[PDB]
Design a protein around this ligand. Structure first.
Ligand SMILES: Nc1nc2c(ncn2[C@@H]2O[C@H](COP(=O)(O)OP(=O)(O)O)[C@@H](O)[C@H]2O)c(=O)[nH]1
Ligand SMILES: Nc1nc2c(ncn2[C@@H]2O[C@H](COP(=O)(O)OP(=O)(O)O)[C@@H](O)[C@H]2O)c(=O)[nH]1
Lengths: 370, 282, 370
C-alpha cells in the first residue's frame, strides 16, 4: 500500500525537496538514489530506488542541486491553465497508479496563498474525486487579493480533501524569532520538513498497528465535516517529560474550546512501561479539556529514530480553536467585498464555509448531535 | 568422491545445459527448426516418407538450417516412428526421442522422455495449421482484377479462422514454454532432482490440455482443426460448399466458449483460456 | 529466408543510414564491417560482413562517413527518371536476388513528400509486382504541390504494398519538443530508427512464434485493402506499466473508431508470470475498444535484448483512425483542384483512395460482412 505524492506551487515544490532530502537521509540512500552500505521498511515512499513524486522556474533550481538524479497570481488565472493541461498531466498520474501494487492515498503539498496553488491545486481536488473515488486525498496545506485566494480554496478542501493538516506561516515566523533568532524562507523550511518527516514515522518502520495512512486518520476524524488537524513538535528524559510540553500552546503552531482526539508519536527508546503512569497524572492534573458527548481517548505510539543519523516528539491535535483562523480570513474577505463574469461562485463559497465554522462552534456544546 | 565426480564433469567434459537444450529441440522453442522440420515433412503429403532414407535424413538436413545447435548435445535426435500409416485428417503420428548416457540417464527417467513424445505430437500437429492455412493465404494471392462480392467475402473467412489458431498458439507459447519454465529454473538453485523434474513436465502436460480431466475441451479442438483442413482442400466453382463449412466453424467456436465457462466452477490454468478466446465478445 | 532493403530519395537514405548504424550496434559488428571479439542470427540482414543495401547527393557524405566499408520536385519527373534507368538499376536487384538463398520480402524506406524518390517509389512497386509475384514487399513510408505527390503514391501503395507502416513527421515533432526539447532532421530520426530496429526483434532473434515476415503481417491485416499499420515504442517497471503507456494517444506515431488487432513486443527479461495479469486489468478497465463483429484480441510475444548494449516495448496496431489522416490530404486536393497531356491519372488516383476511405468507415459497423 504505497502513497503517491504530488507537489504544486513554488511553496509546495520547495517543502517537498526539503522533505525528500530529509527522508532519504534517515535511510541509507545516497543523493544518487543508490543504497549505501553503512529492517527499515522503505517501500511506502520509494519504488524499486526512486521516490514516487510528481513535481509541477523552480524546477531548474532542483536539477542544479547534486540531487539531480533523484527523479499569474489570480485564482481565475490558475484554474484556466489547469483545464488546458488537463490531459497532459493525468497520464503522468495514471501511469504511476497502475505501476503501484495497491495505491492507497495521495499526499499533496500546496499553499492557498500561492497563486499557482490557488488555481491548480483547487482544480485537481475536484478531478481526483471524479476519476478515482476510493482514494483518500490528504494535503499538507499551509495558510499565509490574498484573502480571496485563501477562502476560494477552502471551499474545495472542505468537500474534496478527506483530511488536512494546516501550517500557519504567522506562528512559524514567530517561532523563528524567539527560539531560533533568524531576524528567510530558506531557514523556516528546516522546521517544516521536521514536521512532515515525523508525521510519517510509524509507517516507515515495522510496528504493531499504524501500518497505513488510514491507521492514523480514522481515529481523529469522526464526522465528514470535522476534518482539520494540527501538529506540535516539542524538541527544539522520560515519557512524562515529553507530554507536558505538547499540551502547552507555546509550541503548537497556532495563533468553549476543547480537542477531539490526540495522537502522540514518540521517536525515542524510552521504557514503554511507565507510559501508563504518565497518562494517569495527566488525567489527574486535567491539563486539556475534552468533549462530553462522544467517547474519545488520548493515544500514544512508539517508533525508532533513524540509526544512521535522545528523545523527540510529535503530537497530532484536533482542536476547535482552529475555527478562529478561518473567521479571521473570512472577516477580511467581507472587508474587501464592500471596498473592492457572474461573481457568483465566490458567493456560494462564503456560504459553505459558514457551515464549517458553524459545525465546530456547535461541536463544543453538549448537544452537537443534530 | 562426489566432489571429484562433479568437478570431473565441468573441467573436463552440465545438467543445466541438457534441460535448456532438449527444450530447444523437443518443445520446439528454437524457431527456424520446427519451421524447417515441419515445413519439409508437410511438403510431401504411404510407402514413401516412411523408409529410413528420407525421415532419418530429413533431420540431418534440418539441423543445418537451425542456426543454433550442431553441438554434442545436438546429436542423439533419433527421429523414429511408432506406427505404419495406410493412407484430410489432422493426424500424422511420429515421435522424436532424445538420448542420454550413463551418469545422466539415472536422473532423466526413461518414462519422462516418453511424456515429451506425448506433448510433442500435439505441438507438431499445431504447426500443420499455420502452414496449411498459410498455403491458402498464399494460394489465393496468385488469383489477383478479380474483385467482387464473392471474393472479398471469401477472404474474410480466412482472417476469421486464422485468428482462432493464432490465439490458441499464443496460449501454448505462454504456459508450456515460459511460466512453467520460470519454475524449475529458479526452483533448482539428489532425490529432489527426480521430483522437481517430475513436477516440471507434469505441469507442462497439465497446462497443455492433454490431461484426461479436461479432455472434453481437447475433443472439441479436433472439430476446429478438421474444418480448416477441409477449407484447404477447396483451394468460385464451389463457393457455397465452402460457405456451409465456415458456418459450421462459427458454431463450434461459439460452443467452445460455453463448455469452457461451465468448467470454471469445478483449475486456475483454464482461467487464462477464456480471457484469450473471449475479448470484447460473448 | 533473407530480407533485403531499398532506400530512395533524400529521406530514405538518411533514416536508413542511422537504421544501419543502430542495427550494426546491436551485433558485435565494428563500423568497419568487421566482427570484434566482445546466439543472434545475423544472416537475415547480413551476407558474408556485407549488408544487403541498395542506395538510390547525400550519398557522397554517406561514403565520407566512417561507415564507407559497409556496402526535380514533381511526381511525373520522378516517374520519368525511373523509366530512363529501367534495366540499368534492375540488374542490381536480380543479381542480389538469386545470389541470395531464398528471398522473403523487400523492405522499402522512402518518403512521399514530393521528392524524386516519391515518384521513384511509385515505379519500383509496379515492377516489383511484375517480375516477382511471390515476394512480399513492406514499406516504411513517411508523411509530411505537396498534396499532389502525396495522394498519387497512395494510389500505388494500396494495391502493390501488401503492408505499410505510416510515420507522420507532425506527430514526431510533438514528441521532439516535449521530451527532447529541440526548440533538426538528424534529431528526430534518432527515434525513427529505434522504431524500425525493434520492429524486427522477433526476426533477428529466434523465437517460437513469428519466425518470419509472414508471421507478423498475416494476423493483423484482415483484407488486402485494410493494410495500414501504426507503431508505438514506450521506453523514452513491470508489464502492466508497458502496455498501459502504449495505448495513450501521446505516444502513437500518428497525428466510430476501434482497433482490429494489436501486437506488443516485449524485449526485456521481465517475469513472464504476470503477462496474463496485465491482460486482465486492461480488459476490465476497458481502456481500448475493438471491433464488434469478429472476435478480436491482443497478442504479446517475448524476446531478448542485444546482450552487448531496462524494459523496452513496441506496440503495432491497425487503427481505423488512420482514415482521418487521408481525409486531411484529399481535402487539400479538391481545394488545389479548383485553384491550380490528359490529367486523367490524377482522376483515378483520387477515385481509388475514396474507395479506401469508404472501406475503413464501413469496417466500424457491426454489419461489415456483405
Ligand atoms: N512555508 C513556506 N511558505 C512559502 C514558501 N514559499 C512561498 N510560500 C508562501 O507562498 C505565498 C506566496 O505565493 P507565491 O509563491 O507568490 O505564488 P506563485 O507566484 O504562484 O508561486 C506566501 O504567502 C508564502 O507564505 C516556503 O518556502 N515556505
Ligand atoms: N521524417 C523525416 N523526413 C525527412 C527527413 N529528411 C527529409 N525528409 C522529408 O523529405 C522531403 C524532401 O525531399 P527531398 O530530399 O527534396 O527529395 P529528393 O531531393 O528527391 O531526395 C521533405 O518534405 C521532408 O519531409 C528526415 O530526416 N526525417
Amino acid at each position: 500500500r504505497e502513497i503517491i505524492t504530488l507537489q504544486l506551487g513554488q511553496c509546495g515544490n520547495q517543502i517537498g525537496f526539503e522533505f525528500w532530502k530529509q527522508l532519504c537521509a534517515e535511510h541509507g540512500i545516497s543523493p544518487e538514489g543508490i543504497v549505501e552500505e553503512f529492517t527499515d521498511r522503505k517501500d511506502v515512499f520509494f519504488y524499486q530506488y526512486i521516490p514516487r513524486a510528481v513535481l509541477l522556474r523552480v524546477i531548474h533550481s532542483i536539477l542544479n542541486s547534486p540531487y539531480a538524479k533523484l527523479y499569474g497570481n489570480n485564482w481565475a488565472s490558475g484554474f484556466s491553465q489547469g483545464e488546458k493541461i488537463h490531459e497532459d498531466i493525468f497520464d503522468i498520474i495514471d501511469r504511476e497508479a497502475d505501476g503501484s501494487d495497491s495505491l492507497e492515498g495521495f499526499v499533496l503539498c500546496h499553499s492557498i496563498a500561492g497563486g499557482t496553488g490557488s488555481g491548480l491545486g483547487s482544480y485537481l481536488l475536484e478531478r481526483l474525486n471524479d476519476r478515482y473515488p476510493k482514494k483518500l486525498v490528504q494535503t499538507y496545506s499551509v495558510f499565509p487579493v490574498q484573502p480571496y485566494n485563501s477562502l476560494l480554496t477552502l471551499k474545495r478542501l472542505t468537500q474534496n480533501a478527506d483530511c488536512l493538516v494546516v501550517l500557519d506561516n504567522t506562528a512559524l515566523n514567530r517561532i523563528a524569532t524567539d527560539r531560533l533568532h533568524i531576524q528567510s524562507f530558506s531557514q523556516i523550511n528546516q522546521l517544516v520538513s521536521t514536521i512532515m518527516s515525523a508525521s510519517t514515522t510509524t509507517l516507515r518502520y515495522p510496528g504493531y498497528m499504524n501500518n497505513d495512512l488510514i491507521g492514523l486518520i480514522a481515529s481523529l476524524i469522526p464526522t465528514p465535516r470535522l476534518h482539520f488537524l494540527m501538529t506540535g513538535y516539542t524538541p527544539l528524559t522520560t515519557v512524562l517529560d515529553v507530554m507536558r510540553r505538547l499540551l502547552q500552546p507555546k509550541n503548537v503552531m497556532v495563533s468553549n474550546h476543547c480537542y477531539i482526539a490526540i495522537l502522540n508519536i514518540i521517536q525515542g527508546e524510552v521504557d514503554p512501561t511507565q507510559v501508563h503512569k504518565s497518562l494517569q497524572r495527566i488525567r489527574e492534573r486535567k491539563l486539556a479539556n475534552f468533549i462530553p458527548w462522544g467517547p474519545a481517548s488520548i493515544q500514544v505510539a512508539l517508533s525508532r529514530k533513524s540509526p544512521y543519523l535522545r528523545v523527540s516528539g510529535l503530537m497530532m491535535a484536533n482542536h476547535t480553536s482552529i475555527s478562529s483562523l478561518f473567521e479571521r480570513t473570512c472577516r477580511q474577505y467581507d472587508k474587501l467585498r464592500k471596498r473592492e463574469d457572474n461573481f457568483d461562485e465566490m458567493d456560494t463559497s462564503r456560504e459553505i464555509v459558514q457551515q464549517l465554522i458553524d459545525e465546530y462552534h456547535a461541536a463544543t456544546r453538549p448537544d452537537y448531535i443534530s | 568422491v562426489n566432489k571429484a565426480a562433479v568437478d570431473y564433469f565441468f573441467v573436463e567434459l552440465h545438467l543445466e545445459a541438457h534441460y535448456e537444450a532438449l527444450r530447444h529441440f523437443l518443445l520446439m522453442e528454437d524457431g527456424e527448426f520446427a519451421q524447417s522440420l515441419s515445413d519439409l515433412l508437410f511438403e510431401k503429403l504411404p510407402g514413401e516418407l516412411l523408409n529410413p532414407l528420407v525421415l532419418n535424413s530429413v533431420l540431418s538436413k534440418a539441423l543445418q538450417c537451425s542456426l543454433h545447435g550442431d553441438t554434442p548435445h545436438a546429436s542423439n535426435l533419433s527421429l523414429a516412428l511408432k506406427y505404419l500409416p495406410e493412407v484430410p485428417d489432422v493426424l500424422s503420428c511420429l515421435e522424436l526421442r532424445y538420448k542420454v548416457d550413463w551418469p545422466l540417464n539415472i536422473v532423466i527417467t526413461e518414462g519422462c522422455v516418453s511424456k515429451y513424445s506425448g506433448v510433442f505430437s500435439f505441438l507438431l500437429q499445431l504447426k500443420l495449421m499455420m502452414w496449411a492455412l498459410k498455403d491458402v493465404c498464399f494460394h489465393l494471392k496468385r488469383t489477383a482484377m478479380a474483385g467482387s462480392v464473392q471474393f472479398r467475402q471469401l477472404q474474410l473467412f480466412k482472417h476469421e479462422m486464422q485468428h482462432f489458431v493464432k490465439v490458441i498458439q499464443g496460449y501454448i507459447a505462454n504456459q508450456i514454454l515460459h511460466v512453467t519454465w520460470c519454475e524449475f529454473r529458479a526452483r533448482l538453485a539428489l532425490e529432489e532432482i527426480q521430483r522437481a523434474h517430475a513436477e516440471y513436465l507434469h505441469k507442462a502436460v497439465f497446462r497443455g490440455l492433454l490431461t484426461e480431466k479436461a479432455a472434453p475441451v481437447m475433443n472439441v479442438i479436433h472439430s476446429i482443426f478438421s474444418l480448416v483442413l477441409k477449407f484447404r482442400s477447396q483451394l468460385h466453382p464451389n463457393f457455397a460448399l465452402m460457405q456451409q463449412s465456415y458456418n459450421t466453424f462459427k458454431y463450434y467456436s461459439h460452443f467452445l466458449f460455453k463448455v469452457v465457462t461451465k468448467l470454471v466452477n469445478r483449475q486456475p490454468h483454464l482461467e487464462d483460456f477464456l480471457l484469450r478466446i473471449n475479448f470484447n465478445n460473448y
